Write a protein that binds this ligand. Structure first.
Ligand SMILES: CC(C)[C@@H](NC(=O)[C@H](CS)NC(=O)CCC[C@H](N)C(=O)O)C(=O)O
Ligand SMILES: [Fe+3]
Length: 329
């Protein structure tokens, strides 16, 4: 038998405003959620998630095999050695059901000094032909900035929750250098669904994606209305109920590092469900050289002996390790 995780709905709208006491009351709710199962739903977030879902579906359902090869990351197309992050992640019929499209900061252009310097984890986004996908790039770039704005407000809540001034995290989250990414993931309905695309957990549960901690400061996730996620607790995995009107929020392992595990990065996994659905995460990443000094809210002096960790190294190592452990997506 499988229990259900407590995932509170938090009205985050005060984080956009100037009522400081109301922001502290949101912060308390973020603190409680982060110390419990590690997840909450952000509601009253101001993003049109119906349009996000509609535009994403229109793209997933109209892109052709030829277009997928043209946009494919290096793991699927040897001609594209510069694409380790951004581009198309192909399905393999009979073997791999999931497919996705990842894009990064639109400000990463050939003019950007991190592209000029060839710094790892920075790439120029690739896009389908505008005439074949009218409005897609424009929608996707505006969405990046819409969810950036929500994430900046959520970061104010996390800072206040930890006893800091509201810009403690957000000051490192900037349009000119953020390594944040959007991934538009399609999980298809398939009949028959090939068993090769289904993994079996130690506890016997059929999975599409195994346990992991997120590589992020925080993760800001929209999913369509098909229950699939489970969070690990000491008493076992618990189902996270779906909510296609909100954003599911959690801390990633960079947050766990810098708080000395006070806000743990929750471990979750994806149950196998034979249903057409969408999983659209925004990974809130900082800049390549961002360093946040670790602290320990449990200690009166807040002292932590954990070493400061540069975000770029954290991200490069984390994304490689996640592929090694959980497979190329
Ligand atoms: C659990 C969800 C967040 C979603 N999973 C995911 O988003 C998956 C698996 S944890 N995420 C990743 O592998 C990291 C993607 C990083 C991205 N290419 C980038 O360059 O920044 C799903 O539905 O599988
Ligand atoms: Fe996760």
């Amino acid at each position: 038998s499988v229990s259900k995780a407590n995932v509170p709905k938090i009205d985050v709208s005060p984080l956009f405003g100037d009522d400081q006491a109301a922001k502290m009351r949101v912060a308390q709710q973020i603190d409680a959620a982060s110390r419990d199962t590690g997840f909450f739903y952000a509601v009253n977030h101001g993003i049109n998630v119906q349009r996000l879902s509609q535009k994403t579906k229109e793209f997933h359902m109209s892109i052709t095999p030829e277009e997928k090869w043209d946009l494919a990351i290096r793991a699927y197309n040897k001609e594209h050695q510069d694409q380790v992050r951004a581009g198309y992640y192909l399905s393999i019929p009979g073997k791999k059901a999931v497919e996705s499209f990842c894009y990064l900061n639109p400000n990463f252009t050939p003019d950007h000094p991190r592209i000029q310097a060839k710094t790892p984890t920075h790439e120029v986004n690739v896009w389908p032909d505008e005439t074949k996908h009218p409005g897609f790039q424009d929608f996707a770039e505006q969405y990046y900035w819409d969810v950036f704005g929500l994430s900046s407000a959520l970061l104010k809540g996390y800072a206040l929750a930890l006893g800091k001034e509201e810009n403690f995290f957000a000051r490192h989250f900037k349009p000119d250098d953020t390594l944040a990414s959007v991934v538009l993931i399609r999980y298809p309905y398939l009949d028959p669904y090939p068993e090769a695309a289904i993994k079996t957990a130690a506890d016997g549960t059929k999975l599409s994606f195994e346990w992991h901690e997120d590589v992020s400061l925080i993760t800001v996730l929209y999913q369509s209305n098909v229950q699939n996620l489970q969070v690990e607790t000491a008493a076992g995995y618990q189902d996270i109920e779906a909510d296609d009107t909100g954003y599911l929020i959690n801390c990633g392992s960079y947050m766990a590092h810098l708080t000395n595990n006070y806000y743990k990065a929750p471990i979750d996994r994806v149950k196998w469900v034979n249903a057409e659905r969408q999983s659209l995460p925004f990974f809130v990443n900082l800049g390549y050289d961002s360093v946040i000094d670790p602290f320990d809210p449990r200690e009166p002096n807040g002292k932590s002996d954990r070493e400061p960790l540069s975000y770029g190294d954290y991200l490069q190592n984390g994304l490689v390790s996640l592929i090694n452990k959980n497979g190329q997506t």
